[PDB]
Design a protein around this ligand. Structure first.
Ligand SMILES: CC(C)(C)CN1C(=O)[C@@H](CC(=O)N[C@@H](CC(=O)O)C(=O)O)O[C@H](c2cccc3ccccc23)c2cc(Cl)ccc21
Length: 323
């Protein structure tokens, strides 16, 4: 009955993606279901600003070990996805039921992610390089993990788990688009993730973008971050083009298409700072076309006076004439 509970939580923590996960072949289903729920618990902890950094550090660091602590649970989370923490033993139970080859992979990502969450908890994301570093820790590693799980089940060639660079890029693409899109929500939640070296060139404090009077500078920085994000497209197309399993393809392609759609909607969009912006992926050729169309949507919107105009155009030309 535990597995059932796990699937109930999955649907509770996922609005639409649960259907896609449940559609995974063989062992990848339970393996990915558990992976998602465990990553959700850790995420809920990191995001919980009602918890002090003093309490969070050991929690983030010891999360991996918590997977092997049958009774461990967290009752002080005032987040939306509390239950995943509160009933963690149910999830850890099913995690220990997974094939050891899967456990090995999941535990390693959780440990590394924990170190990473703690590292950036009380410090500013400074350079764009550090932005990649953070993104790698919370989303890149997820791509690395998934890729390794895919290969371990054998539904995907061993190559998939080997190319960490490709799997990482997949994660960075999704993470950055979310950090960009969720700016206001994070501000309101007391969270900051935008690169200081980028925002300090536009405004005094990151929160200043939320102030009406600074909308023009907010949009320019927004545009610069999005241009930064586009650079992962080639790797995303490469990663996706190597997948052989249909359920895996749909699993990976859906979020990447939804991401580019989001970037396209957010690009040069003032609404990103006032609130949340409202916005075929079954074969590679179709996926490429979808991505390309969205890239053009952004291209047409490029304000010739935008500080990043030339940059945005160049990465788009690269995507256009590449793979
Ligand atoms: C932070 C994140 C991007 C890694 C979150 N993340 C994802 O974004 C989900 C998508 C999702 O659930 N979107 C939700 C968001 C919402 O509720 O509004 C939706 O319903 O549209 O997909 C990712 C995900 C799927 C496939 C390959 C990936 C490679 C690298 C990194 C992440 C990868 C994910 C896979 C797993 Cl196993 C766990 C988490 C995630």
């Amino acid at each position: 009955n535990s597995l059932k509970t796990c699937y109930k939580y999955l649907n509770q923590t996922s609005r639409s993606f649960a259907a896609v996960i449940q559609a995974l072949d063989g062992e990848m289903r339970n393996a990915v279901c558990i992976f998602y729920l465990v990553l959700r618990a850790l995420d809920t902890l990191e995001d919980d600003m009602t918890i002090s950094v003093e309490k969070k550090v050991p929690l983030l660091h010891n999360f991996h070990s918590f997977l092997y602590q049958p009774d461990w649970r967290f009752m002080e989370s005032k987040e939306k996805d509390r239950q995943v923490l509160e009933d963690f033993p149910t999830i850890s139970l099913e995690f220990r039921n997974l094939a050891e080859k899967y456990q090995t992979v999941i535990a390693d990502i959780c440990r590394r992610m924990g170190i990473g969450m703690a590292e950036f908890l009380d410090k500013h994301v400074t350079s764009e390089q550090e932005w990649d570093k953070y993104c790698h820790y919370v989303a890149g590693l997820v791509g690395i993990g998934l890729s390794r799980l895919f290969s371990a089940s054998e539904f995907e060639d061993p190559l998939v788990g080997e190319d960490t660079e490709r799997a990482n890029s997949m994660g960075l693409f999704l993470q950055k688009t979310n950090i960009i899109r969720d700016y206001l929500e994070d501000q309101q939640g007391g969270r900051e993730f935008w690169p200081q070296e980028v925002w300090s060139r536009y405004v005094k404090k990151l929160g200043d973008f939320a102030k009406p009077e600074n909308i023009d500078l907010a949009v320019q920085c927004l545009n610069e971050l999005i241009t930064n994000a586009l650079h992962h497209i080639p790797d995303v197309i490469t990663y996706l083009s190597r997948l052989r399993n249909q359920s895996v393809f749909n699993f990976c392609a859906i979020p990447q298409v939804m991401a580019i759609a989001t970037l396209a909607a957010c690009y040069n969009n003032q609404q990103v700072f006032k609130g949340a912006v409202k916005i075929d992926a079954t074969n590679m050729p179709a996926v490429k076309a979808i991505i390309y169309q969205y890239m053009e949507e952004i291209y047409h919107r490029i304000p010739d006076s935008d500080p990043s105009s030339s940059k945005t155009r160049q990465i788009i030309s690269t995507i256009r004439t590449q793979n």
